[PDB]
Design an enzyme around this catalytic site. Structure first.
Site, PDB file in Angstrom:
ATOM      1  N   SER A 272      64.200  72.666  59.801  1.00  0.00           N
ATOM      2  CA  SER A 272      63.809  72.665  58.371  1.00  0.00           C
ATOM      3  C   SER A 272      63.670  74.054  57.739  1.00  0.00           C
ATOM      4  O   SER A 272      63.505  74.148  56.518  1.00  0.00           O
ATOM      5  CB  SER A 272      62.514  71.873  58.129  1.00  0.00           C
ATOM      6  OG  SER A 272      62.679  70.474  58.352  1.00  0.00           O
TER       7      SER A 272
ATOM      8  N   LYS B 215      65.843  74.669  54.782  1.00  0.00           N
ATOM      9  CA  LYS B 215      65.472  74.208  53.422  1.00  0.00           C
ATOM     10  C   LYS B 215      65.259  75.345  52.430  1.00  0.00           C
ATOM     11  O   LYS B 215      65.427  75.168  51.210  1.00  0.00           O
ATOM     12  CB  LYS B 215      64.234  73.307  53.475  1.00  0.00           C
ATOM     13  CG  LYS B 215      64.597  71.928  54.011  1.00  0.00           C
ATOM     14  CD  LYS B 215      63.401  71.074  54.386  1.00  0.00           C
ATOM     15  CE  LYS B 215      63.926  69.742  54.914  1.00  0.00           C
ATOM     16  NZ  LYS B 215      63.093  69.182  55.973  1.00  0.00           N
TER      17      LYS B 215
ATOM     18  N   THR C 242      58.196  76.212  57.934  1.00  0.00           N
ATOM     19  CA  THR C 242      58.334  75.791  59.326  1.00  0.00           C
ATOM     20  C   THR C 242      59.594  74.970  59.565  1.00  0.00           C
ATOM     21  O   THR C 242      60.253  74.511  58.628  1.00  0.00           O
ATOM     22  CB  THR C 242      57.115  74.944  59.762  1.00  0.00           C
ATOM     23  OG1 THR C 242      56.962  73.845  58.854  1.00  0.00           O
ATOM     24  CG2 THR C 242      55.849  75.813  59.751  1.00  0.00           C
ATOM     25  N   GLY C 243      59.917  74.775  60.841  1.00  0.00           N
ATOM     26  CA  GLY C 243      60.977  73.870  61.228  1.00  0.00           C
ATOM     27  C   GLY C 243      60.679  73.352  62.617  1.00  0.00           C
ATOM     28  O   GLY C 243      60.169  74.086  63.458  1.00  0.00           O
TER      29      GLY C 243
END
Length: 261
Positions: free
Chosen positions: A43, A46, A208-209
């Site tokens: 993520s 994004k 974050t991811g």
């Protein structure tokens, strides 16, 4: 350095592969670890999508407030915001905010679709001089994080350089740059990652991811109270597909690289 050895030691202890890029804007110095190796972004990707939407909005007045329909069939896992707006629909700004602040997967998909597909996000990265970033798939498929797979990957250094350009440099106009920073500062998902390893006096905007293979990621712009900003990317992934997230590794890595100030 002791920093290079401490990161190597953190990596060995954690049972995975760690990637770090710190950029200190006071003097442009960099602190890197596997800084030129590819890691699945999950993520953290994004941010690039939101920035691409912001960029299109600079010249096209039917972007940030353009309303998009959210179909029930549009919904994928981890969509806490978009799932509540089937009747109302959402603007591209609202979708960008949801993607960044709540890591809303459907919101990301709507943004990717609006832009013209995953390749268009790569094209935006290329347009800002990032020749490394690649977005290949949509949510949640892009979280497979298969070791050795180049799909939906970047390097810690490329991502740091791009985050700098986008939040502090000339990639976006002032209005858009400021918007992206506001969104990042409002992130709701980052408390246990990079921020956890930093002094309380440092303000943070981050994304974050998380993915398969215990992939645990965070990218941050950092604003000390009395010093120039820092840009920090911490990527971590593990050999086992079912591995649990290890946010504490990112906090510990952030601490190692920023400890000297």
């Amino acid at each position: 350095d002791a920093i290079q050895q401490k990161l190597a030691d953190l990596e060995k202890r954690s049972g995975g592969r760690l990637g770090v890029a710190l950029i200190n804007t006071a003097d442009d110095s960099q602190t890197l670890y596997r800084g030129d190796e590819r890691f699945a972004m999950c993520s953290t990707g994004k941010v690039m999508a939101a920035a691409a939407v912001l960029k299109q909005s600079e010249s096209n007045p039917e972007v940030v407030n353009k309303r998009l329909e959210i179909k029930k069939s549009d919904l994928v896992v981890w969509s806490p915001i978009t799932e509540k707006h089937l009747q109302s629909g959402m603007t591209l700004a609202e979708l960008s905010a949801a993607a960044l602040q709540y890591s809303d997967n459907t919101a990301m998909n709507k943004m990717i679709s609006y832009l013209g597909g995953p390749e268009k996000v790569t094209a935006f990265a290329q347009s800002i001089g990032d020749v490394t970033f690649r977005l290949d798939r949509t949510e949640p498929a892009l979280n497979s994080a298969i070791p050795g797979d180049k799909r939906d990957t970047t390097t810690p250094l490329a991502m740091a350089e791009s985050l700098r350009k986008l939040t502090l440099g000339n990639a976006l106009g002032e209005q858009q740059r400021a918007q992206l920073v506001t969104w990042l500062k409002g992130n709701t998902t980052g408390g246990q990652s990079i921020r956890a390893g930093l002094p309380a006096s440092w303000a943070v905007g981050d994304k974050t991811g998380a993915g398969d293979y215990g992939t645990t990621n965070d990218i941050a712009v950092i604003w000390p109270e009395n010093h120039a900003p820092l840009v920090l990317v911490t990527y971590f992934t593990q050999p086992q597909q079912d591995a649990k997230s290890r946010k504490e590794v990112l906090a510990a890595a952030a601490k190692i690289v920023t400890e000297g100030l």
